[PDB]
């Protein structure tokens, strides 16, 4: 379900973080 | 993993979009 996201300066977009990437 | 996430300037973090 809902997950924590971080901003990727490399991809210029928000990506999810699940203890692996 | 359904709705899109974007950077919120108000919260200074990535959040989910609305609308359904």
């Amino acid at each position: 379900h809902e997950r924590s996201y971080m901003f990727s300066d490399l991809e210029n977009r928000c990506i999810a973080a699940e203890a692996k990437k | 993993h359904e709705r899109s996430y974007m950077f919120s300037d108000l919260e200074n973090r990535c959040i989910a979009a609305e609308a359904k």
Partner: antibody
Amino acid sequence: QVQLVQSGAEVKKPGASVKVSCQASGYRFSNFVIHWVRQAPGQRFEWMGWINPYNGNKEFSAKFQDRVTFTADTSANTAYMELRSLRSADTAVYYCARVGPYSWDDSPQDNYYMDVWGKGTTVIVSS
Amino acid sequence: EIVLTQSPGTLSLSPGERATFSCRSSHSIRSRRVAWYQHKPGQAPRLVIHGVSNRASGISDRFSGSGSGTDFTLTITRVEPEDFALYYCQVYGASSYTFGQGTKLERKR
């Protein structure tokens, strides 16, 4: 205080493998991710990947994902990096570094900088 | 990949002088995940700044990080002999951990 002690210098022939250890003290080993970074003579520091000692989860740089192995022994507060199929370009100083602490309201990986570094382990690869 | 370019290559200064290190990124770093490190030959690198402007524990106020977007800077108000080294900038988090080539803070005589 927070300390990271690495294993001694190594010398290997091309094609072989090397395993470097990083022993931590001064903090809760299972609460912090550990990065592995190297620096070859005349080259820029090069990130290799990280490992979460608690669950063994990890992330690899595309450059080493196929031949590097990250492991951890929580009962010994030690993290290991094994690089296989060694080549001349692998001659370098290999460092382990602990990530920084975090606050409940930060964003993911805001603390993923190299907070504390080990002094590095020299690895020489030559025929 | 994100590419970081540091300037100048070498910084020759005498104790007491102001040191200004520059670091240019290929991508805009909106996350502010930028750090600066100090490295003395033969010793473990040391974190100086994280999050662009947060001074690492044990770091003197004479050190200060700043910048935004594509241009970041490390400044030492008054250079002390203990400061001569190598200084590196780096972006971290979200699968991007590239470092700049470094700037050597050398003592002028």
